[PDB]
Amino acid sequence: NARMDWKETPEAHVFKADLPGVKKEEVKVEVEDGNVLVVSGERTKEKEDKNDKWHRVERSSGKFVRRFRLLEDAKVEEVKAGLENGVLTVTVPKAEVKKPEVKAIQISG
Amino acid sequence: SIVRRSNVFDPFADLWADPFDTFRSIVPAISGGGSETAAFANARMDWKETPEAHVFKADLPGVKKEEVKVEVEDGNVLVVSGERTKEKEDKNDKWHRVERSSGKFVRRFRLLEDAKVEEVKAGLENGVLTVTVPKAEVKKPEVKAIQISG
Amino acid sequence: SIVRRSNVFDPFADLWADPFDTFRSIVPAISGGGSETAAFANARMDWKETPEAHVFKADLPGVKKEEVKVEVEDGNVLVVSGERTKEKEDKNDKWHRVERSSGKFVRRFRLLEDAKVEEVKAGLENGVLTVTVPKAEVKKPEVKAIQISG
Amino acid sequence: NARMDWKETPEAHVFKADLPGVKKEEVKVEVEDGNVLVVSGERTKEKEDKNDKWHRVERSSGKFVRRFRLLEDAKVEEVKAGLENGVLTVTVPKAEVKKPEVKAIQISG
Amino acid sequence: SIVRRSNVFDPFADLWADPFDTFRSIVPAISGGGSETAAFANARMDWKETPEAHVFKADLPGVKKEEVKVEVEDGNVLVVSGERTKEKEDKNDKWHRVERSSGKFVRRFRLLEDAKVEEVKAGLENGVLTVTVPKAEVKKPEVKAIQISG
Amino acid sequence: NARMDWKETPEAHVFKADLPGVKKEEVKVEVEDGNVLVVSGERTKEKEDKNDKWHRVERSSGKFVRRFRLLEDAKVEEVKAGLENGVLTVTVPKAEVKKPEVKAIQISG
Amino acid sequence: SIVRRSNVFDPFADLWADPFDTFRSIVPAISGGGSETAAFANARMDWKETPEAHVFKADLPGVKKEEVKVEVEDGNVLVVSGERTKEKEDKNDKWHRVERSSGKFVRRFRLLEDAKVEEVKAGLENGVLTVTVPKAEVKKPEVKAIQISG
Amino acid sequence: NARMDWKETPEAHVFKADLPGVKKEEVKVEVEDGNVLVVSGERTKEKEDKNDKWHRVERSSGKFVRRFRLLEDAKVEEVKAGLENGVLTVTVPKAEVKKPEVKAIQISG
Amino acid sequence: SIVRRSNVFDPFADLWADPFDTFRSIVPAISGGGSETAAFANARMDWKETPEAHVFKADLPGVKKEEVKVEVEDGNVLVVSGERTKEKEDKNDKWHRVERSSGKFVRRFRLLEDAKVEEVKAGLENGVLTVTVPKAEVKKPEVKAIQISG
Amino acid sequence: NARMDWKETPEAHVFKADLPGVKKEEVKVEVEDGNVLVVSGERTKEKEDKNDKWHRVERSSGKFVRRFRLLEDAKVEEVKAGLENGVLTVTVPKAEVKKPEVKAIQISG
Amino acid sequence: SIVRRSNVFDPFADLWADPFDTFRSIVPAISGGGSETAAFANARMDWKETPEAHVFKADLPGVKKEEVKVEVEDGNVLVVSGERTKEKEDKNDKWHRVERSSGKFVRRFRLLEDAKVEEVKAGLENGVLTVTVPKAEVKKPEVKAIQISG
Amino acid sequence: NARMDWKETPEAHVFKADLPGVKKEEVKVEVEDGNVLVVSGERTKEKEDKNDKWHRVERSSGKFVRRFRLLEDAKVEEVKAGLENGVLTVTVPKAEVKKPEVKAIQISG
């Protein structure tokens, strides 16, 4: 289970993914079927030796797969992917810069 | 499993037309994709529809208005989001027990009718956010009662 | 809970984007409305998508073609329905045990692309209905691989 | 749990409901909010006396509620409701008679 | 797992003497053999024993008497079976939703006493089948109350 | 799970089994311990290739086993087995033709 | 719920012909009557049928033959009962932890054929009771294979 | 849940029932339908006052019902019922004294 | 999983401070170690704290005082143990059904205050063991009520 | 379920509790048995009228109870309790001001 | 249910000596008190004991060292706490989906031996916090093997 | 699951374990980490041949592991282990013979 956020900037749709303990050689970022962002990889289990003793185990390991459907008109050739401090960031440029229409409301009452 | 759009709660969605079919279909898919339920927990919300308006409630204890946001998108989508700030309390304190653990979150609801954004009221009080959305007048088109032959 | 349209299975529906949220939301609504799952049991079906076409399978043991119907609605909705006829077998026979109990049923799937109805093939054999829907040619637009900086 | 079918004829949308053991005085057929068909009633439990003894109980009892959303242009004033042999039938006339578009396919293979 | 005879419901069977032992023993065997529960669903039935007779009820909505059968076997076995006919309704109709899906089925009950077949009454009304089986007279042999010493 | 019916004719006990997608080479019909009818076989899974994509899977596959205890006096050497349209039929001849005793009752009320 | 006779395990009982029906019927009756499962726990047993004989195993750790009893009733009912004696160990000892807690119990199995009681062997070793019941010779009446037409 | 044993002596069928904390005024021993032994009563809950505080609760309370089917030929008028040290004992005399047929086997091996 | 000391029930143990954390942590460890729950079943007990004393109840039907033991360890640990003797009833009797199956067992509770052993009363009656432990006098230090500002 | 934090300052132990929608007249702050802090109250359910319609309900209501064991030497008479913005704060003064012993460690690696 | 001290994970606690008893006791108390499990979710941790040292791992994705704290209390209690800061990212951005929702949290473990605080190493890398606690040398006092008589 | 008792005599702590069907060659008794009693072994499953038929299976098989923490001052070199009639007995001598302090109470009431 890789937790991911999906935010939109006037310039692009940005995806974030918590991938603690994953080296960039274990993560794959692609675009399938022309418009499907696919983030996948493996969180390798550190099996080790029998000399060891486990008192607690809460961290998960194994394969992870995440898919988001991008716009039929997205800069598929301009998608960037960065990995730092256990967080993956994918930047999918938008065909044309333009902040989304959102009308804010005042809070008080 | 492909996320294509944002999660917008709609009380008239078709997934509610056959609960068991829906149930039967997702139980096998629980161990997949991702979920916002954890994040959702930071903002338990109620949605009531009185004849006069739609009233939403959100438990946002210890949250300041500068940390919450109520917007309207595409004419009929109420959006509530925010993030409780770090308590600028004594750096160095000893934390014996910490249950209150809130974070970022975003919620959306599909209104039954396009809302008149200038009429939407939002107030924060005693940790409870309240969003009132005034509906348009209608005589609840009277109820038709059919006599059962046979 | 209001039924507004027919149940059309769509593999890209949004209910699959957050399985647990969906799960969490309907479990409390199971004891409501109605369900076609019982009827659905008379036609367990598979849907496979090979690069060349969409292939549907339906277990319809002991059913005759005059009792099954494969139609296409609104350009992209495959519809499978029918009802196994009463076995015109010896009136007066003693029924020790009866498990095979099939009835009426209707199923719908939302195709990814409008189908060329004259190209759709449907065959019934050994109790298995097979519906093949030819897709249009595409080079599977190549897969783009992004080098991960950082 | 009242089981209901929803069929469409060129002339109207027809609804069927299994309501065994229900007298027409216990069933209500209405149209709420202008276009929502509401079928409800109660399947009264025959409590009886303590002299009795129950060896098997599979039949349900209690309240039932069913709602379907009709077309914004349906003969709401022309809806009929019949009850016979434990089956309820509701006929919602369509604004304009017209069989639905359905292209049948041949089975053989 | 070997089926040797027909399923005859008996309220005095020994499987009821130790519910948990029975429970404990079959849970591991659920994934085996076959079951008539699906078929049974087409005829939910009640069995009441008033002092005067045994009364059975069966929900058979939309069923015609020519489709139901009430027989008596081996002196003390009530048998109810049938199959709701296909609704000879407009061939070509569009099926939006189909939940009502009934089929063939057979049910048997072991009467406490051989029944006088000519006294058994069976009526079908408002979708409910009713089978009344007159018992023989007895003074309910009085109840003996033992004084508890000690 | 192979669904089976067990009917009795004056001439024989007839068994039916839903076996969609099963070729007669995958089904076995036998009589064990002298009087136990055994219907078994496999509903082969069409594993296929990874080029494929599954959108829905409701049909079962694998092994199935069904056993019925015949009469100590049944034409064990005269049992027939037919397979057509996904339905298996086994005919176990009775030692002596004779319709079972069944007293029908009138329905009306 | 009325106990009428002793619990005799029979592998060919009819309750096994429809596991789910049986399951479905007792789950609602678990909160009733009584149960010997607790007592049964003092003697977990296996029953194997080799071509030569019926072999029963019973875990009876720390039990002495004078405390166990293997009998045969009504020609075809194996009966195993007993009660582990109190350990005549140091009266006054401190009991830190006690998991081994065995008591009285009786178990019965319905043999497929009347047993020749003088041929039944019973041995106790390493806490395991073993009861061997010699069957009569038979050529396993050969298996008949029916060619499937159609 | 009242735990009961059912033993048979050459003279009668003896039933035992654990009924801790039950006074003989709360237990009823009867014979219904001519041959059904019915043991029932209530294990009254000591509700008490709110001044109290419960640290552990494992003992059950409420109604209990137990039924055994006696022989169509049992001394129904000679059934005795004793209650001592939380254990109820019911003695149902047999029509004719006679130890049950039981063939014991030797243990050794 | 290492057993280091005897199981002593303490109502103020820390495992009760976070039920779900405790729950969440042991569910995965159920299939391990051993358990006294079976043995515990032979002595269901209640512990009530009236202002005047601690009252323990134990269902020990058919048990004689020479078979039960109430001791006090390390100043504040009530200990209840025993073992119902074999009913010296007719050797040769036929056991139709045996549910009452009690065995050895030991239970311990951590008193809130060291008990004055000479003041502890223990009585056995109608199958119920009762242990009363007199507490020391205190005025329940009055309850302080804080006025809530803000 | 009222979520509470328990922090310790050199001067006192501070407790926090999320109590959205609770007026100070519905909350009670006390000290039982001399050293047990008891926070309790009710989150009243706004039942309202049947004219209303509920589309979503996630917020809880009802009674809540929370207990913490203070030190046998705590300023029980100096405990303060404040309620603001749905958060309750209880300040339990310590017998003698004194930051707790805690040795911090450097993070880097 | 009274919280008296902070939750300190101890692998040798007595609650692990009888999993089922513990389980059996808290299931009924789940609907009470409060829980830190939600908060705990922000820092899933592993604890491994190699012969050379105790190694703890904590998934703290996107967390900066100025937001995490590793301390040692009362000689043998490792404490890990923190709170991921708000992403000072574009104020005004549209949040389509938010699953990553972390908050404040504190965790404690009871070391088997008092740790030499100046030897404890803590590093943060790729979202994973690692705390190594060097143990003192010992020859693992050899394993004694007892020959089983009897 | 190997059931074990833990009793204490003035001379030693005695452990008992139900191990029916286990030969002494399949059981291991040791002392790890200097003071941890470890009882382990396997209850071998008698797989046998396919000619066989199983009508009932309640007995368990497989590996079992049990650990008790002895006193830092226990005659670790004087631990005995006996196996008879499916019951294992381990005797851990105490540094100094001495019955535990236990004050008995009178039962009557």
Swiss-Prot record, chains B, C, E, G, I, K:
Classification via CDD domains: ACD_ScHsp26_like (cd06472)
Disulphide connectivity of cysteines: none
Protein name (Swiss-Prot/TrEMBL): 16.9 kDa class I heat shock protein 2
Provenance organism: Triticum aestivum (Wheat)
Cellular compartments annotated: Cytoplasm
Protein family per UniProt: Belongs to the small heat shock protein (HSP20) family.
Chief location category: cytoplasm
Protein keywords: Cytoplasm, Stress response
